[PDB]
Amino acid sequence: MQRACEMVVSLLRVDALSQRCPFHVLNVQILDLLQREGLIRGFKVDGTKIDILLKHYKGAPVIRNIRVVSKPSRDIWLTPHELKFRTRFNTGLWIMQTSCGVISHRDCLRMGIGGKMLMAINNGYQHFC
Amino acid sequence: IPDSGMSFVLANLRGSLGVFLALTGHTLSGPDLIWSGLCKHWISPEALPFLELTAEKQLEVSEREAAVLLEEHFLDAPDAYSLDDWEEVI
Amino acid sequence: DKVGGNGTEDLFDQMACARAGWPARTLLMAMYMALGAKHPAVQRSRAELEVLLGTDGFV
Amino acid sequence: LAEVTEEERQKQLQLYLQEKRERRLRREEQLQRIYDDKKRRAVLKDRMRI
């Protein structure tokens, strides 16, 4: 959780081809979700560090914003019908951790399972806590 | 035996060059591939990162325009051909 | 699932306690100490032990 | 009410069986993974102590 909140900084770099972040299995899973969503070009696992190769488009980076929801000092959980309202009318990615793995808010909404909201990527200005 | 279309590739060559290759286990390297016809083009690996970085105009040009843009990375191979004076005998 | 060593304290007990004993282990430890680290036989035996146990190449 | 209760009893029994089986499978997977991890760690530590 601390490692993910740290990796936010490494992900929000600009004018950089690649940036390093602390290693953790949770970081690896979030990176898997990001690559499946096509937000990073890739990443590499090197011992204590992970090297994220970032993706750009027309100069600007693909990742334009990261909003942290669940911090190590405060969990945030949502029922399906609260997640629907909170993610209403937004194309951003809200990362959710559930008993079924680290998935997207859209997978969580289709599954109707209760989840923990970790991060919001390219969510514009949409947050509640 | 050859598989995965290797027989087709060999048979699509001029004369019995493919048969000779498959039977004698002859090794052809470099521009020999271009002159035999196995490989169409001669492009350096340095283009692949270049293509990754510059493929954003494929969506600014039309499909045919993008297809022609791909050809900027084709180079001119050396004229040397190992089997130049052996195709007739083969 | 079959795991253990010594006969009374298994490998899961050897891992947990630093005072646990194992005569088979101490035989090799004593041989290494009585021959010397630089001994070619000792070096060969230690390399063989690491490889056979399958813990070589660990980082 | 008897008819509805028969239906509800069937539903509850099926739900209970499903949940029990899947939780058992998850626990088996976790136990197998952790056991293999400890199995390799123990041999590694024993070699280091040797």
């Binding site: 696992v45 090197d46 011992g47 | 340095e46 | 190449g57 660990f58 980082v59 | 590694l44």
Partner: peptide
């Protein structure tokens, strides 16, 4: 923590050695 297993470049290099030459860029003068 020193007995954990995490993929590493040292591990990859050791595996390859059990089984890296740098190259200069070409000039394309012609």
């Amino acid at each position: 923590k020193h007995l954990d297993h995490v993929p590493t470049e040292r591990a990859r290099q050791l595996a390859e050695q059990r089984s890296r030459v740098k190259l200069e860029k070409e000039k394309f003068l012609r």
